[PDB]
């Protein structure tokens, strides 16, 4: 009952979210997932919100320290550059552990248990799989970068094929997937034209059907659509 | 082991907003038993204020949920909320105890009788972290840290009054926090209002004095608190 593992961990995650303690929240949601039971829409949101904040703090710290590594490299201070790169690598290792934790959960529990008729869940988890491989690609190099870049694209591609065949263009999950996948082309693959076509098509397909949406669905769809529009403006 | 490398790590961690790393680095600098410069004092104060501030904010949220759960009579949920509140509480106390240990063993102890600015800074810091302990304690446990908080604040205030101008930002910050201690911690709003008004009026009377921005903001805070306390 209320003393069960799932109930206590979910309660901890909800409290951790209120306290803005997202490492606690993600660890609790990771343990919920490992129970090998399906996640509801709320539980899926708690897991996604928790790890978005956890990886996002590391990404923000990584970019700040990596930017200093660039300036310190150009400035040429070996006594300083060696320690700066060491600090970034410590941040990278935290970042890679977080991403690998997520991908393990997706590969072993979340994607695994999706029934073929659970299209929403598959699109959600496959997009998440592409997202966290992309975060790995943001810091990777050499042959390691190639594998995660290919993994991210492959997850995004399968998710987008399912979403196009199973979700209306105004669906926030499909709209968010198209947004993140176009960001993958622009930022990871350095493919601006491919990125612009994907985002433009997604915006055009959605905006053709906004007028049928209710007030609440309209707000959810247009908020992602504005991000597609802002990306398009910035990409040319 | 190298002092300069630790300070660089503290500065790197601050830029990345990783304040646990920054506090850990400045903890090691203090433990070298060498004096802290003005910049070093700032790095140490910034690091631990951010670390404890996150615990304080998290504690306040969970504590209020604990009270609401208690009023609703949900005993089963209350036990789980309390367990999280206690977990956050112990982290907060460990952070404060670490700072207080650094102050009582390295910073305050190594101050000379003529290092007035450092002594006021550290004694005020000691009152702050005893006040943060008092925020989460009750009963005899609270009274212990409350008495320790007031003692540190008063010695700092006496030194600052004798050695610092009324518009010194360190003296103004000490008066601001000392008045907060009287109001919030020990329920003496009249004593708090009297102290905040003394420091603000003394600062205005000598307002004809390069560090204006640092002093000015604290002065606005003194007035803002006085308005809230009416």
């Amino acid at each position: 009952g209320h003393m069960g593992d799932r109930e206590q961990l979910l309660q901890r995650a909800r409290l951790a979210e209120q306290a803005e303690r997202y490492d606690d929240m993600a660890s609790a949601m990771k343990a919920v997932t490992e129970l090998n039971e399906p996640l509801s829409n709320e539980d899926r949101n708690l897991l996604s919100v928790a790890y978005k904040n956890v990886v996002g703090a590391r990404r923000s710290s990584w970019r700040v320290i990596s930017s200093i590594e660039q300036k310190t490299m150009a400035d040429g201070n070996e006594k300083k550059l060696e320690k700066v790169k060491a600090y970034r690598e410590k941040i990278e290792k935290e970042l890679e552990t977080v991403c690998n934790d997520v991908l393990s959960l997706l590969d072993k529990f979340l994607i695994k248990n999706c029934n073929d008729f659970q299209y929403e869940s598959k699109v959600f988890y496959l997009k998440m799989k592409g997202d966290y491989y992309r975060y790995l690609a943001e810091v990777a190099s050499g042959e390691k970068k190639n594998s995660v870049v290919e993994a991210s694209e492959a997850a995004y591609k399968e998710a987008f094929e399912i979403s196009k065949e199973q979700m209306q263009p105004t669906h926030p999950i499909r709209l968010g997937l198209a947004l993140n996948f176009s960001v993958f082309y622009y930022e990871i693959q350095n493919a601006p034209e491919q990125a612009c076509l994907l985002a433009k098509q997604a915006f055009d397909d959605a905006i053709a059907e906004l007028d049928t949406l209710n007030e609440d669905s309209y707000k959810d769809s247009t908020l992602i659509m504005q991000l597609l529009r802002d990306n398009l403006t910035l990409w040319t | 082991g190298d002092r300069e490398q630790l300070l660089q790590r503290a500065r790197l961690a601050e830029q990345a907003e990783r304040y646990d790393d920054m506090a850990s680095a400045m903890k090691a600098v203090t433990e070298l038993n060498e004096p802290l410069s003005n910049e070093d004092r700032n790095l140490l104060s910034v690091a631990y204020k951010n670390v404890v501030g996150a615990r304080r904010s998290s504690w306040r949220v969970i504590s209020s949920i604990e009270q609401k759960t208690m009023a609703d009579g949900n005993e089963k949920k209350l036990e789980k909320v309390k367990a999280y509140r206690e977990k956050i509480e112990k982290e907060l106390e460990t952070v404060c105890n670490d700072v207080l240990s650094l102050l009582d063993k390295f910073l305050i102890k190594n101050c000379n009788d003529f290092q007035y600015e450092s002594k006021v800074f550290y004694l005020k810091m000691k009152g702050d972290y005893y006040r943060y302990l008092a925020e989460v304690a009750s009963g005899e446990k609270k009274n212990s840290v409350v008495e320790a908080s007031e003692a540190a604040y008063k010695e700092a205030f006496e030194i600052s009054k004798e050695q610092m101008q009324p518009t010194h930002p360190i003296r103004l910050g000490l008066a601001l926090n000392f008045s907060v201690f009287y109001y919030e911690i020990q329920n003496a709003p009249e004593q708090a209002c009297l102290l905040a008004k003394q420091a603000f009026d003394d600062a205005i009377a000598e307002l004809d004095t390069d560090s204006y921005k640092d002093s000015t903001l604290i002065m606005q805070l003194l007035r803002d608190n006085l308005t809230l306390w009416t």
Partner: peptide, 21 residues
């Protein structure tokens, strides 16, 4: 409430994961 104490002293946009809490 909450008396004040002494204070201390482009990339592409991806989808926000808004909470339902």
């Amino acid at each position: 409430l909450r008396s004040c104490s002494v204070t201390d002293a482009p990339r592409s946009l991806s989808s926000p994961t808004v909470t339902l809490s």
